[PDB]
């Protein structure tokens, strides 16, 4: 059973994420849920607003190697009062999927993980994303 | 003239001893303390709780000092100052859900009622009950009462209703009274009977007021009709509606002029003669207790880095209304000189303050009525 | 940061570890793999031949039938037929890295063997290169249906090597970009003063292969891609093939990266109205 | 109910003030049929779309308070129906009707038991 | 009610409605955006201060008016200013009302699509057409026929008309504007010894010049005079409480129109350069043209230049025929008012592309394989 | 400026002066627990009229009122998918933040484009007419913000080759 490709698991841990590939017998990965962006706050010069035109103005890196990045604050979209960066978690996972795993989420199937004490809105806004951004054939 | 909120109660009603000294209040929720005219300061005098149905109206019989209490429970009582505190003394009724308003048959004979249950629970005292008891006008009425006024002969009654139809009634009880004098509106005067009507189902009648002897009567609905019936014009009637914001209150202040107030918070005058439908105004009555010199630029600066409502306007000079007229004004009454010769008048609001007022500046006219 | 490699992060590190392990003589654990890439890939990997000292990668795609028709095989017999291998079943072909297929310098192949995807594409693109170099029009076009709500072919002309396309538009909110921003490429290159011909075509495939204005006034992208020899030299070529073997697939992923992003503005904005809403007081 | 020929007579004769007083004449208040009401509303709205901005205030000052209240019931009747930017000419009518009646003319439409 | 007429161009914006006596929507066709760390961070400011607000804040801002391959290139910075029009000047939608747009002669290919892409997908106008600005001037004069000068802040052009039939080979478009003047003009401050001379003072330079400059009457007489006088020198306040007193420069640098050669630039001087229109024109008309010489712009409001350019032109010209040279009060301001008033000839609308035409093919209904 | 908006919203605020009614009653036949009174309206004579108010030809408002609680809904000229679904990436985003401001009839209601649930509680909670003098006009400003997202989003269209091709 498949899209073109079968199901796989990510366990989306609030320290490290873990996963493996169709046919293996282990998580091939158990890995830092972390990402680094400069937040040194001297917001200055040549100003612009209200215009999403082609950029020269982003400075960011993701995963275990983002831990090395200087002035880049290696944040963690783990859940720890910080929750709101489920916004970044999309772009983050888009990197993971298409660029670390180097994969195709409209062809595979998926299983993903949540805590018992979960509220709806943070997932359900990401459900348009799951089926319009990630456009998966099926998941739960 | 003068104002203060000694503490910021949502004064939902006010009542007194006839010397206007001990202010009782309908509070927030179910928590009363009475305060008193400490010269002109306001200082606590009582704690009351045991009428537990919040509070609604009352009828403080203000000579005899008997607050018949009402609200969202049949633990409704003559509260009386037992020397110690105002304390309960039970009434028995056959209303349900609530009592909104209560009304001494003017000679304090009994009171009339407005129920949470479509009805007039006509309530009469029994020494034998140790308490009141009632009988009911469930019919010919259809729905219940918001406002009440006995005609001065005290067995004759007017009311404003959620049954809308602007009807005049009799409610004599054999075991406390005898039937009243040949009422020109209609004189079938036993229990529960209908004297007269004006065809007006025109909003739920919200204020009812006799002229200075009740030869004519006014009404208003909360839908803000303003209206009358006059007997000597041969059971004549009148109706109008205001221009301004919807009514809180109206009263006669003669047989020919009345004070009205609404969500505009300022009072406006009304004037009349006897020209049937010729209902007529007289303009806004008040002048604000404020002047333009108010300000404190330091906190205006501090809280223009923060931004809560931080784009200014004179609406804020009345906490949204302008005129110092607040989140809202909430009641009006005459203090002294009365519905003929007033020397002072007063008003309440959501701010919890006493206010007293500029009357006799407006004394500037003579005589009234014209048989038209 | 958003970049990629033709060899895979997932694969190179694990199998170079398996080959660090092969150098050490180490014993197995159970690998088998299937997955996907751009271009509709079914990757595979395995413990083939049952035993403690082999690995095999394999791959399968439907339109291999349109591709084995072409002599791709010979460059690959050099670069990868340096290694000793056989096709697996169900897969088109497979690479047996038997741990006795490993050299002294075990690293040296790893990158190359991983980059094989695009390199298989390049192994046949060279024929249209050779057709252009031999001065040949129209030669032997590689009509492939890699995709099918889309179309493509590779072909040649004496001056210039070529590819052509189709792709059906789904939404007008896409079309309003499609029929605008490539016309600030087809009329706009001054700050990007390099590019070969690329013609995105909201209706128009070229004439030897299909014919122009074959869409709903805008509803099919018959894109086309044609090379100046300042690309068809033995160099500027390679850079560019790499982009192309991801381009629109990768782009249509970047779309969503940017869709997500606006919600910064929107977070700020919506939070601003939550501020503004107080001011009624 | 109103008379179509009576209103068109004033309207075609340039007696726009008479067209107004005629189009307001004998309102369908007592009829429970909405169709007879909408005929009167179409008569009145045709007059309202036919006016000149400057002439509105002359015509509005000719009405008594009952005419202004009835007019507000009709302006409201117009406003339920978007089309032809009718609401733009109606807003200019309202501005004059409001200047003549005052806000009590709004209150009285909001109180009505039966209406146009 | 309305249809929309604008000086959408260089200098200030100078817009109004159709038919008005005056442009009214008026501020610089240039804007600024903070050049700074906003050290009082969170002080509630948006990222731009615009023309008049740009000037109110010009010590704060980065500003744009792009490459002399056009007037501008990221016209999608007037992006912002489109809204600055629609709301911040007006509070209205263009999408409501038929629009009179304008563009110059000889614009390179892509213009009109890239424009109309916005003008209908974005500005969504009911229907529109685009004018060329020269004869707008003659409408105000009530004329059709003569030679029309533009020199401005965007551009220059030199335009023969004959009730239409305007000359494709003897109309003379040129990049030139008052825009350009300052690069020579401001190097002089080191002759002035001013250790203090920047970019933002260019506007004050332009100020002093617009207050006190004129074009020299016979320049070596002026040079001998500057070599012998300083009544030339005239005082000017500066923002801390200073004055500077300066004023030979005030007509020295005002020679460069005859001497582009000042930057070593191989261009002829002004009237000589311009004469070539006429030289390429019909020859017969060159009598009658003596009465038909129409001249205008903000750049045209200087003293001394008029008699100078006449005598200069006269150094090219025969005598022989009856002169009229034609340059009105407010010629600088005037052009929008003539173009405003055109719309009264409602005929002017009938040319209009509607949004339908623009939708159906695209603006491929009208762009630039079209002539 | 769009100046008949002044007649429009001055007449809105003249309606919201004629009829700033909302004040409370609980019960007289059925329970004291004050309801979504505008939803649960049984009968007319106690209550405000049901109403609708065009601006033009697509644009209009609905207002409906129990004597104590009220609906609004408002309709917009716009009708392209490029107008709608794109701003509805926001009208999705919007609705949890309605839970942070408490008076939406929380949906982008069709025939209109939105709706509101309004009640007497608010009249006792803080303030007076500065409230509606904010609200009715704030409601335009959040429409003028569509122009703000407009150039924003159109400039996201100007992201396009400005990345992919401009890499080279």
Author numbering:
A (entry chain a): 1 to 140
B (entry chain c): 1 to 372
C (entry chain d): 1 to 281
D (entry chain g): 36 to 151
E (entry chain p): 5 to 375
F (entry chain f): 1 to 168
How is this structure described in the published paper?
Spontaneous actin filament polymerization is a kinetically unfavorable process and nucleation factors are required to overcome this rate-limiting step in actin filament assembly. The heptameric 224 kDa Arp2/3 complex, consisting of the two actin-related proteins 2 and 3 (Arp2 and Arp3), and five additional subunits ArpC1-5, generates branched actin networks by inducing the formation of so-called actin filament Arp2/3 complex branch junctions on preexisting actin filaments. The Arp2/3 complex plays a role in both physiological and pathological processes, such as lamellipodial protrusion, vesicle trafficking, and also the motility of various pathogens. Details on the conformation of the Arp2/3 complex within the branch, and its interaction with the mother and daughter filament were largely derived from fitting high-resolution x-ray crystallography models of the inactive complex into low-resolution in vitro electron microscopy (EM) and electron tomography (ET) reconstructions, as well as molecular dynamics (MD) simulations. These studies led to the model that upon activation, the Arp2 and Arp3 subunits reposition into a short-pitch conformation resembling an actin filament-like state, providing the basis for further actin polymerization.
Here we report, using cryo-ET and STA on lamellipodia of fibroblast cells, a 9 Å structure of the actin filament Arp2/3 complex branch junction. In order to further optimize conditions for image processing, we used established extraction and fixation protocols involving the actin-stabilizing toxin phalloidin to remove the plasma membrane, while stabilizing actin filaments, allowing for a better visualization of actin filaments and bound complexes. Overall, our model reveals the conformation of in total 18 protein subunits (the heptameric Arp2/3 complex and 11 actin filament subunits); however, the resolution of our structure did not allow deriving unambiguous side chain information. The biggest change upon branch junction formation was the actin-like heterodimer arrangement of Arp2 and Arp3, which resembles the first two subunits of the daughter filament. Specifically, in the branch junction, we observe a significant movement of ArpC3 toward the D-loop of Arp2 providing additional stabilization to the active conformation. To derive a more accurate description of interaction interfaces between the Arp2/3 complex and the mother actin filament in our model, we probed for C-alpha atoms of Arp2/3 complex subunits and actin filament subunits being in vicinity closer than 10 Å.
